[PDB]
Design a protein around this ligand. Sequence first.
Ligand SMILES: [Mn+2]
Ligand SMILES: [Mn+2]
Ligand SMILES: [Pt+2]
Ligand SMILES: [Pt+2]
Ligand SMILES: [Pt+2]
Ligand SMILES: [Pt+2]
Ligand SMILES: [Pt+2]
Ligand SMILES: [Pt+2]
Ligand SMILES: [Pt+2]
Ligand SMILES: [Pt+2]
Ligand SMILES: [Pt+2]
Ligand SMILES: [Pt+2]
Ligand SMILES: [Pt+2]
Ligand SMILES: [Pt+2]
Ligand SMILES: [Pt+2]
Ligand SMILES: [Pt+2]
Ligand SMILES: [Pt+2]
Ligand SMILES: [Pt+2]
Ligand SMILES: [Pt+2]
Ligand SMILES: [Pt+2]
Ligand SMILES: [Pt+2]
Ligand SMILES: [Pt+2]
Ligand SMILES: [Pt+2]
Ligand SMILES: [Pt+2]
Ligand SMILES: [Pt+2]
Ligand SMILES: [Pt+2]
Ligand SMILES: [Pt+2]
Ligand SMILES: [Pt+2]
Ligand SMILES: [Pt+2]
Ligand SMILES: [Pt+2]
Ligand SMILES: [Pt+2]
Ligand SMILES: [Pt+2]
Ligand SMILES: [Pt+2]
Ligand SMILES: [Pt+2]
Ligand SMILES: [Pt+2]
Ligand SMILES: [Pt+2]
Ligand SMILES: [Pt+2]
Ligand SMILES: [Pt+2]
Ligand SMILES: [Pt+2]
Ligand SMILES: [Pt+2]
Ligand SMILES: [Pt+2]
Ligand SMILES: [Pt+2]
Ligand SMILES: [Pt+2]
Ligand SMILES: [Pt+2]
Lengths: 97, 98, 99, 94, 103, 105, 83, 78
Amino acid sequence: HRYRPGTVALREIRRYQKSTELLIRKLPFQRLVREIAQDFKTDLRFQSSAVMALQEASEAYLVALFEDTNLCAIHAKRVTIMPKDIQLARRIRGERA
Amino acid sequence: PHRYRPGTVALREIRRYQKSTELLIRKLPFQRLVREIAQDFKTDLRFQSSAVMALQEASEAYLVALFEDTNLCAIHAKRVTIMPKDIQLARRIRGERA
Amino acid sequence: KKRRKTRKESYAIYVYKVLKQVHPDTGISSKAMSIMNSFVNDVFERIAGEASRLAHYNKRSTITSREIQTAVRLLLPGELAKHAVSEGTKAVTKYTSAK
Amino acid sequence: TRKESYAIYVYKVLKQVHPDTGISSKAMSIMNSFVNDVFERIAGEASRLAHYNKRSTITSREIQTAVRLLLPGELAKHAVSEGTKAVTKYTSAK
Amino acid sequence: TRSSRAGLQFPVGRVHRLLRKGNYAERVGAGAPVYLAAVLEYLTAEILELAGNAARDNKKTRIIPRHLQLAVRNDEELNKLLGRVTIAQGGVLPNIQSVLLPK
Amino acid sequence: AKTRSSRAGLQFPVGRVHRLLRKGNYAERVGAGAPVYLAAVLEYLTAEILELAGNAARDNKKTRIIPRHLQLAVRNDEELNKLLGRVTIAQGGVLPNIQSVLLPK
Amino acid sequence: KVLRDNIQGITKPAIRRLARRGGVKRISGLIYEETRGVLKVFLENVIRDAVTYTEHAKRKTVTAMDVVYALKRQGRTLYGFGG
Amino acid sequence: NIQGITKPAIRRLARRGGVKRISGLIYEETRGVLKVFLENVIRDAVTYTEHAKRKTVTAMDVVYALKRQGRTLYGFGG
DNA sequence: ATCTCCAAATATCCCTTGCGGATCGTAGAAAAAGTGTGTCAAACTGCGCTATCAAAGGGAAACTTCAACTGAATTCAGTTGAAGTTTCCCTTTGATAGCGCAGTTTGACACACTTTTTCTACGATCCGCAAGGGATATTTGGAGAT
DNA sequence: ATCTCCAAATATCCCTTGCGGATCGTAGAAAAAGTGTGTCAAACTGCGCTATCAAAGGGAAACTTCAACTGAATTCAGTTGAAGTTTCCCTTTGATAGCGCAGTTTGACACACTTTTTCTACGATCCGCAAGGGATATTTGGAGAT
Ligand SMILES: [Mn+2]
Ligand SMILES: [Mn+2]
Ligand SMILES: [Pt+2]
Ligand SMILES: [Pt+2]
Ligand SMILES: [Pt+2]
Ligand SMILES: [Pt+2]
Ligand SMILES: [Pt+2]
Ligand SMILES: [Pt+2]
Ligand SMILES: [Pt+2]
Ligand SMILES: [Pt+2]
Ligand SMILES: [Pt+2]
Ligand SMILES: [Pt+2]
Ligand SMILES: [Pt+2]
Ligand SMILES: [Pt+2]
Ligand SMILES: [Pt+2]
Ligand SMILES: [Pt+2]
Ligand SMILES: [Pt+2]
Ligand SMILES: [Pt+2]
Ligand SMILES: [Pt+2]
Ligand SMILES: [Pt+2]
Ligand SMILES: [Pt+2]
Ligand SMILES: [Pt+2]
Ligand SMILES: [Pt+2]
Ligand SMILES: [Pt+2]
Ligand SMILES: [Pt+2]
Ligand SMILES: [Pt+2]
Ligand SMILES: [Pt+2]
Ligand SMILES: [Pt+2]
Ligand SMILES: [Pt+2]
Ligand SMILES: [Pt+2]
Ligand SMILES: [Pt+2]
Ligand SMILES: [Pt+2]
Ligand SMILES: [Pt+2]
Ligand SMILES: [Pt+2]
Ligand SMILES: [Pt+2]
Ligand SMILES: [Pt+2]
Ligand SMILES: [Pt+2]
Ligand SMILES: [Pt+2]
Ligand SMILES: [Pt+2]
Ligand SMILES: [Pt+2]
Ligand SMILES: [Pt+2]
Ligand SMILES: [Pt+2]
Ligand SMILES: [Pt+2]
Ligand SMILES: [Pt+2]
């Protein structure tokens, strides 16, 4: 038995728009924060909640960006999000020149 | 009689209006609109002439910027022609509502 | 004792009172409590911030209930602004009654 | 009544930088907006910094990190350095 | 307490202290904390009102962050007020664009 | 050397900046170096814009600086442009710029 | 005397000139009424705040500074009229 | 480290976002975008840390930093 | 439009843990009281905003003609998604080692405050003059036409 | 390929104003100088919590397999908006005069502040028990096949 392309996708959309769980695995993301902080100031520690803060903020940001990117895709009679969609989303937001 | 191709005058107009800085909305019309709107909020308001000029500077700036973004939306959709859905898209993404 | 573990200060108990007032059989998780505590601080600053500017703009040295009111009118959207101006005006009417 | 303005200091700085160049009155008005604008952003963030750190006073330190927070990359470096250099020179006097 | 004289749950005395410590102005009138406390109370009343209902609709007796998010995003005016805010652990409103659904 | 500007080596007015920090309810007290550091920063940024606007007036065969020169200055400079990303310079116009696809082919 | 329908003072040529400054080459016929809507909502928002500032000052004349402060509030800071 | 943000993770994010079909080039772009984002916030978070003469980045330092970028977050000490 | 067939939804029971009440104890709010100064009410005023008019003319409205753009229709290589197998690392759990945050105490010094002396900067005003900016004519780069 | 022609760019003269450089005289504000006072820098200290570690299983990420369906290219015709023309409305300009009200001024004081003792609300810390978590079964809402 096969589900048509797009059907498990739509199922996934419904699932995740219902949950509140973080969708990035905690440890890879934590390594990323420390790598980045390290480039600004060396010998730094983090309260556990601060990484948490950064992951809530990071994910809310990205989720909100895919909403915007998705609309741009649809604006172009497409259904697939592409880099040019993120780029336009970010430009119209004034995040990017 | 001589006749320019469509788009030729449009391009030359873009150059003209991008070189210059004068207010593009007429002055008396704009002031009537402000007074009308002010009135629905409060009767008996008066305006410093420069308060209206500030409003007009801010409004022409806002719209000129919105048309920049509207154009990016038309071009994104492989069109050269701006349309209502382009502005709606620009305004949605900018986070403007109402 | 002797070394005291400081003292955090929140609106958690006033938020709990108001929640009772409106949903007596409903309760609230500590995470959601924390969110309401942020909201109150966030709004307090947004308001006190405008009031402060209004007082400066008009060359005055005091944040009165008049500045809070117009701060609120600037900060809050349509219907929320209208209700908030009621509840605020009413509290002050009532507070100055009581002596 | 007196209307305070940065116009004289802006002329002075303009003469240092472009000695045969003038400034129209509107252009001056913008420059005066720019200075009050930036002053506000800096004193504002400096104010938060002192509150965040339970402190009663605004010192050049807060102005400095407010600058680092507000100005973009290369502009923060030069302003940080023009600023510390003026304070050093100022202490070296009295 | 000034809170009782004013008919409020929210602490008129604290709000008053907090106004004097925040360097908002040289002086704080006597009416100003009352009106502020009152407004803080009204708005926290208004969120919890809608958030509670969202706990009902979702069959719960405890309000969690996701109910605050549904309260907020489903209400036009609060959505505006919190336009630039993210509620940790709130997730998003269920929304799927028309053209993505099958015919 | 009398004035605090002269002392600090500055054109911008340390005395005025001190007073405005005090009468603006930013904090109870204001350190001695603060208005110095801050007047120095205000002077640097105005010198960087006037410099860049100056060039723009000269490129447009002009002797006197107008708002369009400030506008051209700010928006052709990645960093000033960002600092004033949310600002409108009255009577500045926009940068000349026409997307490619609209050019005659 | 009654003020009515003034957004039609924002004419078709005027909207076109603004599009030109914005680099717009071709404008669909429906744009002009969308643009009036937008401008109206823009002005209602700024003016609302300008007028609140005015009412607070116990004034009847709306000043450049009320408009300048209103725009700052909306995050649309304006240089050239004070502040 | 930036590859720790894995393809399937970006897909979950995109799905909460309401995205049905994702082009293969999207996964690199998002990684670029997240890096720029995290950099800006951490730059400011660390600025606040240094100023407090601390060696530990706190939740508040982050909340302050997100407030500065105009991205107020509730639930961690707002 | 009617039968087979998943995955999500709902039902149900047993375990886990964080709500939410209760105990206790302090930091801060309240009461009471002497103190001055910002605010307010009320008098007076002339900048400048509203209103009007009249004339000139720049520009808007309404119209015809048609070039070219939008979008409907068609085709299809290929990029994705669904699902299967394989490989890898994340999460949990149980502490132990110790960094460094934040509590406590304090006096030296730096900043506030307030009075007198000193001079900077703003408001009001003239002036050489190149900078413009406008009204009028001509030349020029290149779109469109022959 | 070469000519024709139109609007923007350049050239000419004239003249208005807004500027920059004086000189002025004059209110307010900076500085100089003295003194009262609380903030905060350092130094020493407890322990909360970040870092780390070691292991082991479970499930997630990676990689593989296939072909469904999507995006991107091509072609075309009817639609529609640009260009240019004509008519005359209404905006702009310049001045006018009346006066509504913004903003300055001045005395009287209610009202906020600040200091000190008394009353007490709300923070910290505690944990029994039920709301919710998680595990398993049964139902229901659809998708995909024929
Ligand atoms: Mn009306
Ligand atoms: Mn109820
Ligand atoms: Pt002003
Ligand atoms: Pt905090
Ligand atoms: Pt607990
Ligand atoms: Pt005590
Ligand atoms: Pt006490
Ligand atoms: Pt007084
Ligand atoms: Pt007095
Ligand atoms: Pt005429
Ligand atoms: Pt005419
Ligand atoms: Pt004409
Ligand atoms: Pt095919
Ligand atoms: Pt194929
Ligand atoms: Pt492929
Ligand atoms: Pt230990
Ligand atoms: Pt240590
Ligand atoms: Pt320390
Ligand atoms: Pt002491
Ligand atoms: Pt000339
Ligand atoms: Pt000229
Ligand atoms: Pt000219
Ligand atoms: Pt030619
Ligand atoms: Pt040609
Ligand atoms: Pt002048
Ligand atoms: Pt001048
Ligand atoms: Pt004087
Ligand atoms: Pt001294
Ligand atoms: Pt002391
Ligand atoms: Pt295993
Ligand atoms: Pt497994
Ligand atoms: Pt397609
Ligand atoms: Pt055709
Ligand atoms: Pt048409
Ligand atoms: Pt036309
Ligand atoms: Pt008169
Ligand atoms: Pt008045
Ligand atoms: Pt007095
Ligand atoms: Pt249960
Ligand atoms: Pt349950
Ligand atoms: Pt459950
Ligand atoms: Pt069924
Ligand atoms: Pt069924
Ligand atoms: Pt079916």
